[PDB]
Design a protein around this nucleic acid. Sequence first.
RNA 1: AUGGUUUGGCACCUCGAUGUCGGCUCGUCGCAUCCUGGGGCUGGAGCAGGUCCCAAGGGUUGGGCUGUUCGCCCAUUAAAGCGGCACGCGAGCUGGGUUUAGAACGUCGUGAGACAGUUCGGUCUCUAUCCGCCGCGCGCGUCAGAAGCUUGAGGAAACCUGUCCCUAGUACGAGAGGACCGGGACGGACGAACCUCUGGUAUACCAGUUGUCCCACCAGGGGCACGGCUGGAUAGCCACGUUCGGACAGGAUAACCGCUGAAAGCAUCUAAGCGGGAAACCUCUUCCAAGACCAGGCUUCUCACCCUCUAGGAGGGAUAAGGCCCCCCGCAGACCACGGGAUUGAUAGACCAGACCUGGAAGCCUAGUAAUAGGUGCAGGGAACUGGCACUAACCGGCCGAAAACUUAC
Lengths: 122, 113, 54, 214, 118
Amino acid sequence: MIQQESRLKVADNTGAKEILCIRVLGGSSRRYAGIGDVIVATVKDAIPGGNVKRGDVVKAVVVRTVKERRRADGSYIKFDENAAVIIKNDNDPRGTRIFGPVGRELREKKFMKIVSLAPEVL
Amino acid sequence: MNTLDFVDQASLRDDIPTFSPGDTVNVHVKVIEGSKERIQVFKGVVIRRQGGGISETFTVRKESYGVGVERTFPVHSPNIDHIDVLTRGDVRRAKLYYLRELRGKKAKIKEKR
Amino acid sequence: AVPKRRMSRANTRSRRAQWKAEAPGLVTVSVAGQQRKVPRRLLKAARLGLVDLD
Amino acid sequence: ARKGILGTKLGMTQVFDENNKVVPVTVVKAGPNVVTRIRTTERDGYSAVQLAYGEISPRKVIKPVAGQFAAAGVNPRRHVAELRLDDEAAVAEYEVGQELTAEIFSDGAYVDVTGTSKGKGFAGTMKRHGFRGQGAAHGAQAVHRRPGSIGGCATPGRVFKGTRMSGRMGNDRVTTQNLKVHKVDAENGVLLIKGAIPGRNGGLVVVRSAIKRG
Amino acid sequence: PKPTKGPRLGGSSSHQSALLANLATSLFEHGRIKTTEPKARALRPYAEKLITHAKKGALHNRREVMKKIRDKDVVHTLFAEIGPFYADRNGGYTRIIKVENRKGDNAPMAVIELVREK
RNA sequence: AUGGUUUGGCACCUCGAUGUCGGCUCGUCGCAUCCUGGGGCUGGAGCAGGUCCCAAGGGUUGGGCUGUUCGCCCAUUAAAGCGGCACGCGAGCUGGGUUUAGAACGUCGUGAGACAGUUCGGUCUCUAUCCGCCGCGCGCGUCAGAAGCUUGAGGAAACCUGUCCCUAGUACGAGAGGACCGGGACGGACGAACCUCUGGUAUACCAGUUGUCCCACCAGGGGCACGGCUGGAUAGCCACGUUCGGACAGGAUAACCGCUGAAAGCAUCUAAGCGGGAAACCUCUUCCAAGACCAGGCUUCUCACCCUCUAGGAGGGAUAAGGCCCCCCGCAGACCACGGGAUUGAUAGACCAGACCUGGAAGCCUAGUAAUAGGUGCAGGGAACUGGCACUAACCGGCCGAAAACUUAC
Ligand SMILES: [Mg+2]
Ligand SMILES: [Mg+2]
Ligand SMILES: [Mg+2]
Ligand SMILES: [Mg+2]
Ligand SMILES: [Mg+2]
Ligand SMILES: [Mg+2]
Ligand SMILES: [Mg+2]
Ligand SMILES: [Mg+2]
Ligand SMILES: [Mg+2]
Ligand SMILES: [Mg+2]
Ligand SMILES: [Mg+2]
Ligand SMILES: [Mg+2]
Ligand SMILES: [Mg+2]
Ligand SMILES: [Mg+2]
Ligand SMILES: [Mg+2]
Ligand SMILES: [Mg+2]
Ligand SMILES: [Mg+2]
Ligand SMILES: [Mg+2]
Ligand SMILES: [Mg+2]
Ligand SMILES: [Mg+2]
Ligand SMILES: [Mg+2]
Ligand SMILES: [Mg+2]
Ligand SMILES: [Mg+2]
Ligand SMILES: [Mg+2]
Ligand SMILES: [Mg+2]
Ligand SMILES: [Mg+2]
Ligand SMILES: [Mg+2]
Ligand SMILES: [Mg+2]
Ligand SMILES: [Mg+2]
Ligand SMILES: [Mg+2]
Ligand SMILES: [Mg+2]
Ligand SMILES: [Mg+2]
Ligand SMILES: [Mg+2]
Ligand SMILES: [Mg+2]
Ligand SMILES: [Mg+2]
Ligand SMILES: [Mg+2]
Ligand SMILES: [Mg+2]
Ligand SMILES: [Mg+2]
Ligand SMILES: [Mg+2]
Ligand SMILES: [Mg+2]
Ligand SMILES: [Mg+2]
Ligand SMILES: [Mg+2]
Ligand SMILES: [Mg+2]
Ligand SMILES: [Mg+2]
Ligand SMILES: [Mg+2]
Ligand SMILES: [Mg+2]
Ligand SMILES: [Mg+2]
Ligand SMILES: [Mg+2]
Ligand SMILES: [Mg+2]
Ligand SMILES: [Mg+2]
């Protein structure tokens, strides 16, 4: 439920606050991006001395969305506002933490580091 | 007349603790990793029930860091290790729809006395 | 749009050929000593004796 | 072989797995079907079994239908519908007047359910064939939501039979293939299926062994 | 009842509510009333509702009927005569009978009346 | 040499009117194929290529820029095909420029004006007759008449694919790197279906609230002010929601690969024969389908009372099976059609019971001078949901609707 031109909160210690969704990767005319999808985002505003300055183009893995997300037992989970995470070719997050909860689907997605160092997984 | 009352019974789990929209609860998510099971902890706010024979249906949802989180699960959930409704509660209805937008000091779940 | 020409007499009348009225079968009721004509739509009221038939 | 059964949808529900998941399910009460005729190839032209199920007051049932049922030797049934066989092997195991029940299905066997679709009434093109709505502003003139261009121009100078445009949709036979079975009732003829089969509460649904997978 | 499916009778919720209130008022004030049968079928639910509410005579119930029909005369008559008058019978207090189609617009006409047999 | 697509030539059709570029919606076809499929060769170790052959089943980006087509750029995918179709499509829409009337700039002209130079704003009409097409009905014939069930000629629909693991870091390669065929799982877009979950909507549900008018007064309620504004949600409908699908297999083939083989002691995939061989064809899957006039097949019910004409055939009645109308109606529906029921009955509506929603009715009482709070209590109220209830409405029922035959074998 993350779309082109959608604002995203940053859930990492890079120095990013607001970013734009470039697209949803891995699909011809793919149209939505929910938690677990590797999507491409651009930095719109960032910390002055942060690790990445605005205008850079980086890939992100969406984690926190205002749209519910299913799970095996029919569980639907709503969050307060969409949140992404910055990542590069090796699929290693460019930050060293995460603020706010996260979703268990990342473990399935094999981004072990994120959920392993997350403050809490739900 | 829900001709499935008698097929519902064939799988309906006994000892159904009561739970009300707007109670504080916890759940356990039996998850397998490397062919191994485990138990975790989680808090939530059952927002709605939908009783259905064996289809009595509901979820849960918590708050943290100024944000919310849920879990949806059976009345007779074999995944919920125990539906430990923390403190019995009520709310303005049986279902908290406006809970998706209240922020700060607006969105909690009342505790009855 | 409009027509390109006159539609033949026969064509117009053929189109007309299925637009007509129909006649039903009436019903008599013996109430109050009199038999009046009412479509079965009314038969029970006819028997009871309150239907406004001249 | 290519067994078959009629049944009704009375609602639809979900069950909670021993696999520990949750699955939606539809209530297809499979009343006991009764064989009221045989289709022997040598004397009819093919192999198949006649089926009927239900209850109708004798005055509600036509005289010829009642006579046919009597000659069959079974009580009146609410409708009649017959399924086909694939070989005389299954044929030899069926016999006029025999009663058939939901027992015939062993769990884990994919199934196919088909029946009349919902009554949608006449439908606009956009809803029917999933068109896209035009620009509803920037100056549409009573054309916010209509089909639009319809073919070539003087070549082919026609409108190409088959073009998908407005036409009353729904309310026709439809089938859903490869639906996992979930629980077979025995005492009171009930059958639970994952998914959402077509039809309507109180509608008529015919189930049969799945074709694709098995 | 079940909702008036097509373009509803009058063409607005307020108009329907009013029209029906006045219709019921007239029906109880007179005891029999001739109108277009479709309006009769639509009205039947409201008259039956009011009769049931009259079934028991209390301050709450009469406030209810006042809010519903807004005519103190008809409320009084309903609660004083019809209410007790229909204690024994249970449901189906009115009877719909059709009459000749109206001349002005041919619209089907049906005479409606409360069951006066009991 | 081919095609007729670009720039062109001719002026044969149209000046008593053939609306023009783009965009939008919708598409349809060809194949000189973009990917997906199958092959030949490589300067083909492998991966990854290059090239040519068969193949049109399916699919084939979104944005910034400009009116743009185009093109560049950014970033994805397997790909971002080339074209024909009045440079597809204004009696389907837009008018952004082209293309009137004002004005202006530069330029040409003494000039009025002009400039396939630029710049700002500038009326887009039609109730579908016919063909056509998407659906739904009426009439008749199917050879006594009816209710059902079909077989199936014959049409239609669908046909896409990515990623990851195992074989295996093995064959291959010095190393770097990294196989083929084959399975399994999870994905994108697309389609069908559905309301269980999550949600949307919710105008007979409820409540809060401003103004006002009204109901004799107040207390309480109602009218109106986009529902007066708001917050909730029944059912139903629906998608973001969930289930499923694209096959497997088979037959005959393309290109291609072959075996045994003389013409021509050899050689030779071939002229005799026999084989393999792909999303291409025919079936397999689903839907329509006996108006299939070649009108099919299988059951069950009514299958004999007349008259007359002038006996040749025909005209006037009898009806049952069943149908129609009628009534109540449906999740069926534009009207029609279809489905259900019509007393020996649950079709509808009330009723009861419940669920559900709303969340604490009014009245009284108590505390507070009050605005209010609590009890009376899980209050009151309650559409479309679940079961039963003849209480009302659907009937002492009318009307349509029974066999010329000929020839042959047994
Ligand atoms: Mg649809
Ligand atoms: Mg649209
Ligand atoms: Mg206009
Ligand atoms: Mg408009
Ligand atoms: Mg010329
Ligand atoms: Mg000419
Ligand atoms: Mg001319
Ligand atoms: Mg002109
Ligand atoms: Mg034009
Ligand atoms: Mg043009
Ligand atoms: Mg070719
Ligand atoms: Mg290839
Ligand atoms: Mg090559
Ligand atoms: Mg091709
Ligand atoms: Mg195809
Ligand atoms: Mg073309
Ligand atoms: Mg053109
Ligand atoms: Mg075109
Ligand atoms: Mg063109
Ligand atoms: Mg037009
Ligand atoms: Mg036209
Ligand atoms: Mg112009
Ligand atoms: Mg101009
Ligand atoms: Mg000028
Ligand atoms: Mg000058
Ligand atoms: Mg000059
Ligand atoms: Mg202007
Ligand atoms: Mg114009
Ligand atoms: Mg016009
Ligand atoms: Mg016309
Ligand atoms: Mg065929
Ligand atoms: Mg919603
Ligand atoms: Mg909604
Ligand atoms: Mg309303
Ligand atoms: Mg007042
Ligand atoms: Mg007052
Ligand atoms: Mg009050
Ligand atoms: Mg008012
Ligand atoms: Mg208004
Ligand atoms: Mg509001
Ligand atoms: Mg819906
Ligand atoms: Mg040779
Ligand atoms: Mg050789
Ligand atoms: Mg026939
Ligand atoms: Mg009959
Ligand atoms: Mg509620
Ligand atoms: Mg109800
Ligand atoms: Mg009901
Ligand atoms: Mg007659
Ligand atoms: Mg003859």
